[PDB]
Each structure stands twice: as C-alpha cells, then as structure tokens.
Amino acid sequence: GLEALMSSGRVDNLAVVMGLHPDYFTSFWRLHYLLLHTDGPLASSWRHYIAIMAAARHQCSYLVGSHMAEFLQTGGDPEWLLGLHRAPEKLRKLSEINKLLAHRPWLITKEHIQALLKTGEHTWSLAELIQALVLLTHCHSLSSFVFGCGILPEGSPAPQAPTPPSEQSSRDVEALMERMQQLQESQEEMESRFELEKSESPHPDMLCFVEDPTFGYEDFTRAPPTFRAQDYTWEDHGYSLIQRLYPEGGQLLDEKFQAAYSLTYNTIAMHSGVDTSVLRRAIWNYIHCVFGIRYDDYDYGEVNQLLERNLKVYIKTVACYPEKTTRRMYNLFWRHFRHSEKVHVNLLLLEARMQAALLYALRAITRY
Known part of the structure; x- marks a missing residue:
C-alpha cells in the first residue's frame, strides 16, 4: 500500500x-x-x-x-x-x-x-x-x-474493513482454483445462458436534491433488454466520442478502466502462483450482464460456476441498491479471502458499472 x-x-x-x-x-x-x-x-x-x-x-x-x-x-x-x-x-x-x-x-x-x-x-x-x-x-x-x-x-476508516490490524506484519478455496483450472484448458445455448443469468436477480434531508426517489433498478410493476457489446464497445466507439468532445478525461477514463481490469497480484487469498484473469473477467462480465450487456463469445455458464451465491447477492446489491449493504453481507461471502481482495472486487465493480452507464449515454449521443 x-x-x-x-x-x-x-x-x-x-x-x-x-x-x-x-x-x-x-x-x-x-x-x-x-x-x-x-x-x-x-x-x-x-x-x-x-x-x-x-x-x-x-x-x-x-x-x-x-x-x-x-x-x-x-x-x-x-x-x-x-x-x-x-x-x-x-x-x-x-x-x-x-x-x-x-x-x-x-x-x-x-x-x-x-x-x-x-x-x-x-x-x-x-x-x-x-x-x-x-x-x-x-x-x-x-x-x-x-x-x-x-x-x-x-x-476507523471503515466498520467492515479494519485498516489498523490489516496494515502490518504477521479449503473450498482450492476447489475454486481447481475449477479455474478446467476452464483454462478449453453454440446456440450461449445466448439463452445469458438470458437466465440476466433475469435471475429514509433520511429526509437529501430527498430534495433528486426528482423521483424510489426509482430503482427493480421494476415494481410486474430483466433489462439484451444488448450486444460489439454494437457499441468502449475500445472502438465510445473512447473516440469522449476523445473528440472532452480530450483530457477521455484518456484518463481509458487508463483507469484498463488499470482496474488489468490489476492483479496473481494471488488468491494466501496462494501465490495463479493467473486469475478468468475470475476477474467473470466479476466484470456479470455486472455488465446486470446492466444488460452480452459479450458475443463469452460462456455465461462460467459465472455461477466461479462466483459464490453470496458474492453474487453482494455484487448485485452494491451495483444496484448500494445503501442497504450490511456488514453481515460483506462478511458472509469469500470468508477465507483477505480484506484487500474485497476492495479489489469493489474496484472491478464500480468501474464495470461506470462503463456500462457511460456506454449507453454515449450510444445516445452518436445517435443524434
């Protein structure tokens, strides 16, 4: 650090x-x-x-x-x-x-x-x-x-991540690694594996800064529409549009998405030899799948195969309903993983979320 x-x-x-x-x-x-x-x-x-x-x-x-x-x-x-x-x-x-x-x-x-x-x-x-x-x-x-x-x-910077004990000198996880192994060695049920994952699922003073509170990810009137990522990617389409209109922060958004996607210490909560590019891609792709974005030749079966039941409910809460995150929920997933690696998921998550939000708004500008 x-x-x-x-x-x-x-x-x-x-x-x-x-x-x-x-x-x-x-x-x-x-x-x-x-x-x-x-x-x-x-x-x-x-x-x-x-x-x-x-x-x-x-x-x-x-x-x-x-x-x-x-x-x-x-x-x-x-x-x-x-x-x-x-x-x-x-x-x-x-x-x-x-x-x-x-x-x-x-x-x-x-x-x-x-x-x-x-x-x-x-x-x-x-x-x-x-x-x-x-x-x-x-x-x-x-x-x-x-x-x-x-x-x-x-x-106490946080009540979930304790920094002062975290700072200093001092099983089933192996299962996850083994599973990661089998994936690395390796057509119409690809689109319909994405469809199942996608649909799967106070404080008076700051209400005045918003138009419509209680507008939420959830419908409350009854699944986003499916969107092919290749139609409007960051690399090809959306990076060019921000570059021409706002030169300074186009470059710094690209370097920061690429910094958080690339970021690895090659470790898995007290194991040093892994390439976890596979695990992080799943976290990144699942959050894009919550915001309706399918990647054209990615096996979405890999997601719930690698991501726990409690990591999914945590990732989806923090991405969609970030308040009503509790400490019980933070502790209840990846119990044998280090505190720094939970922060790591928060990085991947926020950046994936932002990219999704930005790509739809830049999609609306080029169509005008």
Whole structure:
C-alpha cells in the first residue's frame, strides 16, 4: 500500500481505503483531480452540485456532505443547498438523465439528449454535457464504493474493513482454483445462458436534491433488454466520442478502466502462483450482464460456476441498491479471502458499472 499517506490524517477518508491498491489509486486520483480541481467546461461550484445530485440518488451522506462543504468553499450560492427547486433551470434538466444513469442506463434514448440541448435558455454544450455525464457516473460509482467498503464519514476508516490490524506484519478455496483450472484448458445455448443469468436477480434531508426517489433498478410493476457489446464497445466507439468532445478525461477514463481490469497480484487469498484473469473477467462480465450487456463469445455458464451465491447477492446489491449493504453481507461471502481482495472486487465493480452507464449515454449521443 501507500501506508505513510493512509495513516496520516491529512487525506480524505475514502482515499485511504483505496490506498490498499496503489496502481488503481494512481489512475483514480487523476480523474478525481481532473473533474474536481482542473480548468474545464463547467464552473467549479457547478461540478460540486452535479456531484451532490448524483450521490443523492443512493442516499450517500458521505459524498453529499463532502461536495456540500466543497460547493460552499469554492464560492457556490448557498440557496442551492435548500433543495433542487432552488438551482438554475440548466441544472434541473439534468435530473432526468441522472436517475437513469444511476439505476437504469439502458433507457437513455436520443430524446433525453435532445432535451438537454438546442433549447433557447441556458442549454448544454457537448463539451459540458460530457463532463457532467463523467461527474454523474463518477459519483454513482464512488457511491457504490463507499457503501461496499463501509467508508464512515469524518466526524476507523471503515466498520467492515479494519485498516489498523490489516496494515502490518504477521479449503473450498482450492476447489475454486481447481475449477479455474478446467476452464483454462478449453453454440446456440450461449445466448439463452445469458438470458437466465440476466433475469435471475429514509433520511429526509437529501430527498430534495433528486426528482423521483424510489426509482430503482427493480421494476415494481410486474430483466433489462439484451444488448450486444460489439454494437457499441468502449475500445472502438465510445473512447473516440469522449476523445473528440472532452480530450483530457477521455484518456484518463481509458487508463483507469484498463488499470482496474488489468490489476492483479496473481494471488488468491494466501496462494501465490495463479493467473486469475478468468475470475476477474467473470466479476466484470456479470455486472455488465446486470446492466444488460452480452459479450458475443463469452460462456455465461462460467459465472455461477466461479462466483459464490453470496458474492453474487453482494455484487448485485452494491451495483444496484448500494445503501442497504450490511456488514453481515460483506462478511458472509469469500470468508477465507483477505480484506484487500474485497476492495479489489469493489474496484472491478464500480468501474464495470461506470462503463456500462457511460456506454449507453454515449450510444445516445452518436445517435443524434
């Protein structure tokens, strides 16, 4: 880890936990510093208010409190913190695309984009809309990281991951490895194995920053639509679109997705020789399968073969309903795995989630 920084009291509480993995922290901090501290298309107070709205969707009083204080510090109009009905017309148009990015990103059509542009009064640029979509998705994915790892506010970095015993000098798992073995050596029931996996399945003060609370991943009126990843990948399509509209953060989103996907110590909770590229691909692909994205020649039977019953319910909670994550749930999966590796899954998860959300919104922009 980056232990001298972590144990120092001079840094953010969420940043400390992330310090366990320095290769991801490098890349995460670049985007954090670009979005919230560098000259960009939107004023510095508007960026902190977009982040409140985004984090309010999951009732995250950690991130709403940070950006509330930073909004005020950076010279934001304090009326705006009384509620969303007090912010400019430009910023309320954004809370229809925000609830979708958070909860049901597949529903983002071209009409949502059109609404945000071309009107007479204070309409959004592409330069600015792109930056706001990266802020909204960044704060949704930090919001799932905060509840997943248990990050407590400032006034014990977490109640789930104990850092002070974790810092220092000191079975069935083998089964999982064996299974990983058999996969490495190796057509119409491929699409219908994805279909089964896919359908398988308070706090008064921050309701005022959202349009429609209780909008949720779940229908409550009765499975996303199936989407071929090759139609609109990150590598080919979506990276080019962010590159042309917002040059600085296109490169830093690519390096950070690739940093969290690539990240391995080649270990499996006290075993050193494995290549676990197979396990991490499953975690990444399952979370894309929750957000409706099928990969064209990936065997989705591999998922519940490698991922426990309790890792699945944990991953799906943290990705979709991040509040109502409990410590019982965090402990109840991968019981013999090290605390740093649970954080690792939170990394893969947030980044997979973000990519899915971003890809649907960029799909809506190119179709316009």
